[PDB]
């Protein structure tokens, strides 16, 4: 199986691979003539865990201001609850008739449903983390649009003192995100893009210092200095937009649950 992040992989494994296997062993049809042992107590443990998960999820629904969580968490609760009802039914059916083929299939379907709803909740939380990172990226893009307004050395010192720490915060968030992505190609793209942006930052500040000097001296170097600053801002902005794009990618190879 291929998951989006190491957090999700750490939770969905080992059961995702177990269910993936069990489905190949019981595609649909299930003619083995074997009995399933009493699942009443193991199923009661799943039901208790599912009810607890829905309770915990509802704490976020009741407190969050993020409307995309209030919208996406409740359908996952319904999926796990309905899937668990199937699992309880299946265990009751199998306790009455351990050799039942139709019940073994409620059982497998209920298990898939629990895994799917749990995966949906985890992806909702993941998507909210990504939105938080993108807000920071967009804030840097916005402050980069202010570079063109800087026409004095005092304003350049102020600009540098605001942008440096902001870029450090963005870099920290990208570093913390990339480290847990499972796709090496995406980690490499994020690390390379963030390094390009970090390397362009002193180039930008230097270009702004040249622009301010040319402005103050009222010399013939202003249009060249301005174009060189704009070129650097354009490249930094293109790179941050590439980060934003990579942060939202889901590879074709990721298993859907």
């Amino acid at each position: 199986p291929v998951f989006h992040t190491r957090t999700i992989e750490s939770i969905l494994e080992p059961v995702a691979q177990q269910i993936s296997h069990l489905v190949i062993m019981h595609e649909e049809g299930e003619v083995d003539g074997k009995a399933i042992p009493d699942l009443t107590a193991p199923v009661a443990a799943v039901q208790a865990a599912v009810s607890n998960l829905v309770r915990v999820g509802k704490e976020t629904v009741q407190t969050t201001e993020d409307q995309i969580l209030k919208r996406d968490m409740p359908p996952a609760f319904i999926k796990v609850e309905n899937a668990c009802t199937k699992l309880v039914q299946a265990a009751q059916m199998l306790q009455s008739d351990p050799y039942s083929v139709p019940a073994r299939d409620y059982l497998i379907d209920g298990s898939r449903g629990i895994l799917s709803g749990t995966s949906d909740l985890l992806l909702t939380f993941d998507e909210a983390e990504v939105r938080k990172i993108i807000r920071v990226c967009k804030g840097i893009l916005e402050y980069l649009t202010v570079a063109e307004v800087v026409e004095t050395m005092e304003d350049l010192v102020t600009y540098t003192k605001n942008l440096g720490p902001g870029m450090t915060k963005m870099a920290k968030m990208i570093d913390e995100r990339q480290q847990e992505l499972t796709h090496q190609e995406h980690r490499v793209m994020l690390v390379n893009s963030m390094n390009t942006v970090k390397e362009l930052l002193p180039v930008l500040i230097s270009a702004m210092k040249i622009f301010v000097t040319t402005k103050n001296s009222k010399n013939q170097g202003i249009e060249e200095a301005l174009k060189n600053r704009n070129f650097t801002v354009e490249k930094m902005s293109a790179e941050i937009n590439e980060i934003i794009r990579v942060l939202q990618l889901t590879s074709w190879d990721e298993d859907a649950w």
């Binding site: 059961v15 399933i36 193991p42 298990s111 985890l122």
Partner: peptide, 23 residues
């Protein structure tokens, strides 16, 4: 100090894994 969604989800998948280990 309250249980996280991650801890609660791991309880779910552990219990589901333990159940499936019986088939």
């Amino acid at each position: 100090t309250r249980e996280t969604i991650f801890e609660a989800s791991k309880k779910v998948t552990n219990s589901l894994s333990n159940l499936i280990s019986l088939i």
